[PDB]
Design a protein around this ligand. Structure first.
Ligand code: HEM
Ligand code: HEM
Lengths: 680, 678, 370
């Protein structure tokens, strides 16, 4: 059990009498009053201790990445990697290390929707036996900006307008696009956010990236540059925008529920941890500067090398104590790893330590059960709000004769202490500048765009068209086109159409035709369909339900999560039509006989909103899902104008349909259902 | 200007150089580094002071009502009400008092959707010349529970499950319905939240209530029991659930944007302050106890008496400093008003003062500009985190020879001091009980349900059906049905259908057929259609767009907010089909010629999702909106199987369409489009 | 109650502990004491400031040993992980746990059943509270004469710091309501007129148990004794034997000399009479009370004499062994006085230990009108 160390602070209230927080059994359902219909007494200590705790329940949300969810798991090393790093957790084959991972969006506050369009966080803690090591990453490999000092500008610009706090969890407003166009380094991440990476299917279907180049360091102090990669074993998958929007309303908790359910059902997600490794002397050898976080390193120059695998298999017991309270830091480093002079990474080291003081209102947040290392803390730190320990050493200072030198200094040769990479040097003038090597903001967005499928390219363009059409300032929209046009003239043209602005002239300085692998989502079939959801549309009239039941049992044997939907919760029914929506499912199947609710008296029930069964099948089809109808239910497909042999449409007997749907699920989204510029 | 007093704290940065927080001009776009590609230096004081401020921007959200928005305005008394209260803001005809109001949901965290189904907050501050007086109310006249000590129980149960923090801003889960059925007092508020009150059209289309019985007290110390009401001058309006859900995703900010826009467009919303006034001897006279906050007093026993009018006419300049930081308290009371022994209200007095300590991290939150009274603060309080004043009186205690008795004691007779109603007495044993007069949890929910239109009743039934079907535990569902059955056997039966269960046999103990006025939403037409939104579906091809401009110009001259929609932002187009959704509008009109986007090639642009124009018209129709098509655009109505002859459906020329749409907007929702059981 | 363990970390234990009068258990209840009533609110509330959060009862020093089971969750610094996901009551889903306790089940707390409220809601105090003078007089009546003089001299000292003349007059007017004699005696120091008696509250009643100086100590265990010695001659060997005997008798002894020679616990420079309950000069150490020995760069001028002087003037047992009597003579202190002891080591030890029980010798303090 990854949560094993947390067991000692777990509190079971079953079979117990109610108490105050200072002990003593009580009742707490009535206020103490002065007479029968009397005023409440101040001496009601029970009322006040209960309400005080309630009144003070909330802590500040995270300043960014406020919306998220997490789970515990185990990381397993595939080998002894002491040849490239002294890091203990990678020091042997099959070595296991507990982890906790929190996934998130970026902009929205605590209660905003999981399926907002946004960059997503992917933060991992390794509780190693040489300290906590955090890889605080995202599902996109490049960041908007090049210097940490600009983070409040970025964040202010994408978060709600400060006059009315509108809009929630969205970059679709003036200030965000004023920023993206005024600070062109942002264009690369913006393109990734406008792609499927901005609206993934689940946390489990995301890759993860450390983004920054870090350093791996060996015992003898030799270093290599490194990019961290998390490669999802469930495969990458994304929604379409018009679907994500409905889903934001129908189930704001779509992603946190997906993760929870996968883990509860014994389908723990896994990712492989992989690295790109680069010689120190090649930091500027690949067409950009590896200290620049707005660029990624094409796998064709440096392939991924797999170090191990992480599996998330335990949900938290209390979301607040565990998920909400956990405090990640890139400053959480261990011997064997070092920083680089990435000016974005540099400032992060300051900010995440500092922000905990606000979020936890004190300096002792590392003493919280979810933050505690498993390797033990020995130092001369004392006092601090909420100090949870009692220190025995009264000589809390170094150096000292009285404490015999304990606790003792550890370094490269003694005590396996941390050490900064021995070869690192500083050269030149103290400066408030950025290297001119950081200056190309267009080549990689163009590279990224070239590397997507034609329909994926269209999704990016349509995302931009949708977003920029919300910008009220005409000049900002012009500034946006001008920047887009430096990346690609065709992209600018296609976006300009939506905005009713003139197709601008080519600005070819940065244009190129290069491609790189592995940045696309939709052109690779999923390697597994386990956990994927099938909504089975049935009816309580006739024999449809019994057929629905058999269909479900078969699909379940194949690892799918099936929801049988009907007018009311009859035996075998998982969900009513009133409660149902296509957004909940990866495939939609009409069970035989259920064609009766797509037309006629059966479609006219007080039990669900008018048109609901048809809308479900329609949404499913239009959003590119595998859709199907068993036997006579093919009538339902006709009723919404869908033809039986379209791509990703299956009509026939149960066996056929099952086969077809499972095939369709691997493709996941059928892209031929989406118009591409130049079809009309 | 209601915000006038805030002007001295406004900071204008136009035409200025960037500075640190301690002054000194700076640049702050580059970290200071050791060498061209070097590490950032600790001595970069500029980086640290900027990022520290950013790192610390967030404060805890409200423990309840976290999601909300507000505005400034003016309350005007219609009279000298000294014959019923000593309260200064009510002491003269035409007397004006600045206000700030915040509207909210209850359960959702800060970025949750406006159109979640929930009770709504309606909190009003009067910055009177005798202190801040807050009426911290809801858009529903009764509350779930009868003793404040149960508040954490109610709120824990409705908010997300504590293991996974699901579901956001919804009562549609096991724990909530477990509590509602385990604590039957909750049933009355539940029925209201399951009606249109749970999914209102806007903050501007809500009534408000203080819920509790309070006391109005005259200078001589005589008291009357009082209920506070806010009556909207815009009329009440509500959405339908299937619409509210989509709107939650299409625009989480629907209500805050609605309020903001109405104020900027010069359409400041108004409410009348009205009271029910009854003698102390009526406390238990009307079949329930007026100290019981789970009951309301039917207007048939005590009519509304209008005291004045509040108009919200200024938006904030900074949402955080004003809306987020404002700290309401029912304990903010003034001379002329007093509490009652309502056990719910009693505990609130403690909770709102205490909780500010968490939210504002200190004791001086009343010094914040949005919280400061206009009337002067003079006492011996000193120090505390963030102390913003410098006190001149060094003899900070009373009594005292050395300060010559200042600041001085004020009471009923000197200095217009606050005073507790002189006749209030306590009698009997100290007890941890509630009166048996509180015991009937079923008669008034039945009264409420009886007083709705048949389709409104169906909406309540269908909300319960939707919600209760999310409950995984079978026994909890059975518990819910048993409790509903005590209110109405018919309700229980109709809900039980969705759940696939048998309702218990009728239990006539609390059944009755009585009705009461003013609790329905859909039964009365709106008094104005100003600000209501019309989505006009057009197209960039041919002559549609020019005709849409003409339609828009006419509609706007009659007070409407019109959005011209087309495939791309052509001249005269307000929004693209890609960006459009029916949830944003109160009426949908197809401009002549736009029928080309409902079928054929016009419907298949890569500029918008497949079927989008048809979906907007379809949603608009099924959600009960006025829908219409000018001229040949009737083909669009035909394409979705909607007939010209239907109520709330309009075709023909621009003149017939405009007149029909405007009349339909008064009806607001066409309830004949919704099926009723049987 | 016996206190037998010091804390290991002062901050974590002593600084962090949070007392409340609202920390009450079954079998105790409050009364309508208006001072007590408000404290209940204040001590809970103030912890929010001092500890910056609602979870201070979770701090090790604040935790009860008896188990905490309720539906409270979250809050700053939440140190536990709650298993029960149905964190509300009443509830079907949690099976009724944690369960209500009361007078009849689960040994719950209960308010005294017979307590009643009766009358009008008021912002008043009962007229039964109005006599502010009788008990102060009772208290003053029940102290020894010198003990009474200490009270008067404390008031004389303090009120003489008051700059405002009317405040000083107001004080005398209040003192005079308790005792005309007390008012007159205080008035002397303030240079104000002895006011006219107001007999309304005067009385001669006494009560037992409020005096400190009227009773000898039950034990002299732990009481410190500072032994003034010197590194010259045989004084230190004698100081050592004196120390060994006194510590056998349970006292804590500090041998003091010019420097930290073998046997010396403290130097004269570091020493002061305030540290000790008795002061005895070791034989031979009279050499540091005058002449060459009294004049050393190792300690401030007059230090050994000042220690003996302070010791005597502050009413402590003081003594000198043998020739050290000269030290007593050098400060005008005579062997015949109470709490002054001279002679052989045996006589001095017995005397000092008997004197430590009296603790303060009040003959050395002048009383008004003596
Ligand atoms: C490569 C660039 C970045 C990545 C991959 C990244 C990723 C993340 C992630 C995943 C989280 C959420 C951790 C969680 O789940 O609790 C987070 C939070 C945060 N980030 Fe970053 N971020 C980046 C840039 C920055 C920069 C430049 C700054 C400021 C210098 C910054 C400041 C913060 C702060 C203050 C938090 C809140 C931490 C807390 O409250 O515990 N981030 N970031
Ligand atoms: C008739 C019953 C109630 C009504 C009408 C009501 C209404 C409201 C409203 C409108 C707000 C939001 C104020 C704002 O916009 O900032 C609020 C917040 C709050 N309520 Fe109540 N509520 C009721 C019951 C209770 C009870 C019984 C308690 C506790 C005993 C309570 C404790 C709180 C707290 C602690 C807040 C947050 C205040 C802040 O952070 O500034 N409420 N309530």
């Amino acid at each position: 059990d990854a949560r094993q160390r947390l067991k000692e602070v777990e509190v079971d209230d079953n079979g117990q009498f109610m108490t105050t927080d200072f002990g003593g059994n009580i009742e707490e359902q009535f206020s103490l009053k002065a007479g029968g219909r009397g005023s409440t007494l101040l001496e009601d200590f029970i009322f006040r201790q209960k309400l005080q705790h309630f009144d003070h329940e909330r802590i500040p949300e995270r300043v960014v990445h406020a919306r998220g969810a997490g789970a515990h798991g185990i990381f397993t090393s595939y080998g002894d990697w002491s040849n490239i790093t002294a890091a203990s957790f990678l020091g042997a084959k099959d070595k296991q290390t507990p982890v906790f991972v929190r996934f998130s969006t970026v902009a929205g506050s605590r209660g905003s929707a999981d399926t907002a369009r946004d960059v997503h966080g992917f933060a991992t803690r390794f509780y190693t036996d040489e300290g906590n090591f955090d890889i605080v990453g995202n599902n996109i490999p490049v960041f908007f900006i090049q210097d940490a000092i600009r983070f409040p500008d970025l964040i202010h610009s994408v978060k709600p307008s400060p006059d009315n706090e509108v809009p929630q969890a969205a970059t679709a407003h003036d200030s965000a696009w004023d920023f993206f166009s005024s600070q062109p380094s942002a264009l690369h991440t913006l393109f990734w956010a406008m792609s499927g990476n901005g609206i993934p299917r689940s946390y489990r279907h995301m890759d993860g990236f450390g983004i920054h180049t870090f350093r791996l360091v060996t015992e003898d102090g030799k270093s290599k540059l490194v990019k961290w990669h998390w490669k999802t074993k469930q495969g990458k998958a994304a929604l379409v925008w018009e679907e994500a929007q409905v889903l934001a309303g129908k189930n704001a908790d779509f992603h946190r529920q997906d993760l929870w359910d996968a883990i509860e059902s014994g389908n723990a997600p896994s990712w492989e941890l992989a690295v790109q490794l680069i010689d120190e002397d090649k930091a500027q050898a690949y067409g950009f500067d590896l200290l620049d976080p707005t660029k990624f390193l094409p796998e064709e120059f440096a392939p991924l090398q797999v170090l191990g695998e992480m599996t998330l298999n335990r949900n938290p017991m209390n979301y607040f104590a565990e998920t909400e309270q956990i405090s990640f830091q890139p400053g959480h480093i261990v011997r064997g790893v070092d920083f680089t002079e990435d000016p974005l990474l540099q400032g992060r080291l300051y900010s995440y330590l500092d922000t905990q003081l606000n979020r936890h209102r004190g300096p002792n947040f590392e003493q919280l059960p979810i933050n505690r290392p498993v390797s033990g803390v020995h130092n001369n730190h004392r006092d601090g709000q909420g100090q949870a320990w009692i220190h025995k050493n009264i000589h809390h200072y170094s150096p000292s004769y009285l404490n015999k030198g304990y606790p003792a200094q550890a370094n490269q040769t003694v005590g396996r202490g941390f050490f900064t990479t021995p070869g690192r040097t500083a050269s030149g003038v103290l400066n408030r500048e950025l290297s001119a090597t950081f200056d190309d903001h267009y080549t990689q967005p163009r590279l990224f765009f070239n590397s997507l499928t034609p329909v994926e390219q269209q999704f990016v363009i349509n995302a931009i068209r949708f977003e920029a059409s919300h910008v009220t300032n005409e000049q900002v929209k012009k500034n946006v086109l001008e920047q887009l046009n430096k990346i690609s003239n065709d992209v600018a043209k296609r976006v300009a159409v939506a905005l009713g602005l003139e197709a601008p002239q080519p600005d070819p300085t940065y244009y190129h035709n290069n491609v790189t692998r592995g940045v696309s989502i939709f052109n690779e079939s999923l390697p597994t369909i386990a956990t994927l959801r099938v909504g089975v549309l049935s009816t309580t009239k006739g024999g449809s339900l019994d057929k629905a039941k058999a269909l479900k049992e078969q699909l379940e044997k194949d690892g799918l999560k099936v929801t049988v939907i009907a007018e009311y919760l009859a035996s075998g029914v998982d969900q009513t039509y009133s409660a149902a929506d296509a957004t909940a499912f990866d495939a939609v199947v009409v069970a035989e006989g259920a064609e009766r609710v797509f037309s006629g008296k059966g479609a006219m029930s007080p039990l669900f909103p008018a048109g609901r069964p048809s809308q479900i099948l329609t949404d499913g089809y239009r959003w590119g899902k595998p859709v199907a109808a068993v036997g006579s239910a093919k009538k339902a497909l006709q009723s919404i104008g869908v033809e039986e042999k379209e791509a990703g449409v299956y009509a026939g007997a149960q066996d056929e349909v099952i086969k077809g749907v499972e095939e369709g699920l691997k493709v996941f989204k059928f892209l031929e259902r989406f118009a591409v510029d130049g079809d009309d």
